[PDB]
Amino acid sequence: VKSQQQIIDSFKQANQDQLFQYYDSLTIDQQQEFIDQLSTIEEPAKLISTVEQAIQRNFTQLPNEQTASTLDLSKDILQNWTELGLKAIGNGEVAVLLMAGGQGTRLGSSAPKGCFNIELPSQKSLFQIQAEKILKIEQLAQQYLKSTKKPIINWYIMTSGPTRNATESFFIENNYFGLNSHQVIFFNQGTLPCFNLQGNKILLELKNSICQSPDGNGGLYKALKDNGILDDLNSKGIKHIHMYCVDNCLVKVADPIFIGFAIAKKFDLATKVVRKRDANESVGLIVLDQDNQKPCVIEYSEISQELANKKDPQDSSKLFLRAANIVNHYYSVEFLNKMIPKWISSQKYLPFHIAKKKIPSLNEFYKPTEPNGIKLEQFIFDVFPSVELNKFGCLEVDRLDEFSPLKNADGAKNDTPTTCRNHYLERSSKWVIQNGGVIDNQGLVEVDSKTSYGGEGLEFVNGKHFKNGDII
Numbered sequence: 001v002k003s004q005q006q007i008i009d010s011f012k013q014a015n016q017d018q019l020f021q022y023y024d025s026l027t028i029d030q031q032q033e034f035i036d037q038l039s040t041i042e043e044p045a046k047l048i049s050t051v052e053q054a055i056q057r058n059f060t061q062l063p064n065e066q067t068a069s070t071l072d073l074s075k076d077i078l079q080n081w082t083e084l085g086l087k088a089i090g091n092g093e094v095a096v097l098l099m100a101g102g103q104g105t106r107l108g109s110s111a112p113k114g115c116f117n118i119e120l121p122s123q124k125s126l127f128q129i130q131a132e133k134i135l136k137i138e139q140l141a142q143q144y145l146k147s148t149k150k151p152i153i154n155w156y157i158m159t160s161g162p163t164r165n166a167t168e169s170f171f172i173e174n175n176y177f178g179l180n181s182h183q184v185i186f187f188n189q190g191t192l193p194c195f196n197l198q199g200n201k202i203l204l205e206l207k208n209s210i211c212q213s214p215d216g217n218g219g220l221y222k223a224l225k226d227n228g229i230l231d232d233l234n235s236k237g238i239k240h241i242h243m244y245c246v247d248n249c250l251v252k253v254a255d256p257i258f259i260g261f262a263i264a265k266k267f268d269l270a271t272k273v274v275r276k277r278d279a280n281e282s283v284g285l286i287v288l289d290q291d292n293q294k295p296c297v298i299e300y301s302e303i304s305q306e307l308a309n310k311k312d313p314q315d316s317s318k319l320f321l322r323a324a325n326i327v328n329h330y331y332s333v334e335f336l337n338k339m340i341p342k343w344i345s346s347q348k349y350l351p352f353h354i355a356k357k358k359i360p361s362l363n364e365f366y367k368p369t370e371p372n373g374i375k376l377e378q379f380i381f382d383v384f385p386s387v388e389l390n391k392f393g394c395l396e397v398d399r400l401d402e403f404s405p406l407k408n409a410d411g412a413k414n415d416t417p418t419t420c421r422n423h424y425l426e427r428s429s430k431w432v433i434q435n436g437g438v439i440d441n442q443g444l445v446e447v448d449s450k451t452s453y454g455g456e457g458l459e460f461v462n463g464k465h466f467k468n469g470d471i472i
């Protein structure tokens with residue numbers, strides 16, 4: 001490590017003299033704490049350079065050979081992928097990577113987003129729904145293979161540094177929701193300094209502290225390496241990884257169909273999409289970059305308003321680019337072993353993305369009105385074009401069964417606790433009604449994962465009646 005003076009010199013040489021405006025009026029402990037914080041920043045000179053650089057497109061649809069759809073495949077082909085997936089789960093070759101993010105502040109909660117309660121009749125948090133989803137599929141895999149005990153699906157949860165304790169305590173308080181305490185593994189995501197609007201000066205949060213924020217889901221790769229997560233994957237002999245975001249309340253965790261799909265096709269990388277809701281839906285789009293003939297994702301905050309509304313040449317009723325990204329990825333561990341060192345070393349695969357933000361910080365503190373600074377983010381999918389086109393898979397699935405994100409506080413039209421709650425109940429009710437069950441008009445039921453992972457094993461409800469709010 002470096003001395004007090006050396007950290008100060010390096011930052012000053014990087015033109016961050018403003019970080020030391022009040023240094024001399026700080027107590028010694030405040031100075032030492034400041035230096036320690038500035039120490040966690042690897043290569044400030046580079047980083048400030050990278051940011052500076054980051055401040056200063058032909059797409060088409062994915063070739064047909066790289067796509068498949070759960071809405072079009074025969075039940076036999078889907079069953080075969082399900083079996084290939086349950087076998088991998090059953091052999092202990094499947095692990096899950098969760099991007100937990102940080103606090104559900106935007107939703108009106110200080111707690112981690114995974115603790116959010118969408119008010120289902122069971123009152124189960126997002127974390128609990130995903131945990132029972134995992135427990136359930138482990139049992140279905142055990143049944144398929146006829147094993148004496150259920151297989152284990154290690155669940156690596158990436159938390160932000162500030163939500164780490166509250167996330168782990170929540171799991172402990174709940175006895176891990178039925179999972180083995182050793183299969184829930186927590187690791188912290190990194191952070192990046194926040195900059196002023198011109199992106200040349202790091203912002204002071206306090207007179208002895210800089211503004212920092214989670215470095216985006218794209219920072220998952222470096223966090224994996226640094227926290228020994230990739231090491232663990234090798235030590236446990238894991239071959240397949242399913243990665244998703246905690247805000248999707250309908251998420252099929254460790255979905256065997258998605259894994260079977262990658263296995264059947266021998267893909268290094270694969271991703272899930274659903275038909276775009278509307279031209280303005282804030283959703284990334286999976287396309288083929290015609291320039292380099294590589295798959296990629298165009299984020300909603302960076303796509304041309306012209307491309308977003310472009311109609312499809314072979315059909316005027318459809319949007320040309322309509323394969324919406326639902327942050328649901330598959331990686332083979334072999335691919336991660338080969339590519340992670342590459343992805344984390346050069347900005348070519350993980351360029352920084354700039355987002356203007358209202359950031360509470362020194363002018364004396366103050367919570368601003370208009371944007372006053374910038375947050376930096378690496379996007380998880382920026383590595384997609386580093387894959388070989390024929391090793392990439394894109395699986396379209398049904399939005400009604402697989403995607404309903406919690407993004408906004410109640411009040412908004414889309415992606416609120418209410419839309420999640422209703423879509424969740426509507427799916428449960430559809431499964432029940434579809435198996436002969438009868439729900440009393442105006443009623444919606446909730447299906448417990450313990451009962452059904454994704455609609456199977458519900459035949460027993462044939463003829464039975466249910467009342468609004470029953471849990472099945």
Ligand SMILES: CC(=O)N[C@H]1[C@@H](OP(=O)(O)O)O[C@H](CO)[C@@H](O)[C@@H]1O
Nearest residue numbers: 217282283284325326327379380405
């Ligand atoms: C970098 C990233 O992962 N962006 C994702 C993510 O958007 P956010 O609103 O930034 O969380 O979720 C969307 C699905 O809700 C997906 O379409 C988009 O591509």
Ligand SMILES: [Mg+2]
Nearest residue numbers: 064065067068
């Ligand atoms: Mg296809």
